[PDB]
Amino acid sequence: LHKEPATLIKAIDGDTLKLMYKGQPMTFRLLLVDTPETKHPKKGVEKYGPEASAFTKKMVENAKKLEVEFDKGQRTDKYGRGLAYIYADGKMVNEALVRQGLAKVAYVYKPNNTHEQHLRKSEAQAKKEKLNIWS
């Protein structure tokens, strides 16, 4: 796996970003994590949804550098969203959310599961610490 640069256009939700990648504007979905949603009329603003969204937003907006890292499987989902691990100043946004109890590890689709065990370890720790959704 390798990292490539991207530029923030817009943070949309806890787990969805609009980036400029290879000169094109693109929506990215964070791989392997589910954050509570702010969107949807069919749900509403779920609990911690707003918190997860502010966390993702500040972490990507305050970064000097953003990088995207595709996994080994498909790189877009059926909605045309890029599927990637996102890094802000070298720190993985997907892991940060999980480590804070602001996201669960998603149902996983091989072969797009390279950082699966890393994330599940951060998730067991946030659980252990009873943070946010594990409160």
Contact 81, 29 (CB under 8 A): yes
Query: What span, in angstroms and rounded, lies between the C-alpha atoms of 85 and 56?
Result: 13
Give the determination technique.
Answer: X-ray
What are the residue numbers of the active site?
29, 37, 81
Contact 61, 99 (CB under 8 A): no
- What are the residues whose beta carbons fall under 8 Å from the beta carbon of 22, sequence distance 6 or more? 4
* CATH number of the domain residue 82 falls in: 2.40.50.90
Q: Do the annotations mark residue 13 as ligand-binding?
A: no
* Cα–Cα separations (whole angstroms), residue 16 to 10, 11, 121: 9, 7, 23
The residue among 61, 82, 52 whose CA lies nearest residue 10 is 61
Query: What span, in angstroms and rounded, lies between the C-alpha atoms of 13 and 57?
Result: 8
Q: What is the DSSP string of 19-37?
A: EEETTEEEEEEETTEEPPP
What are 25's strand-pairing partners?
20
**How many domains is the chain partitioned into structurally?**
1
Q: Do the annotations mark residue 77 as ligand-binding?
A: no
Give the domain range for residue 72: 1-135
Contact 133, 99 (CB under 8 A): no
Rg (CA), the chain: 14
Q: Which long-range contacts (CB under 8 A, 24 or more apart) does 53-57 make?
A: 53/11, 53/13, 53/14, 55/14, 55/96, 55/97, 55/100, 55/102, 56/11, 56/13, 56/14, 56/15, 56/17, 56/93, 56/97, 57/11
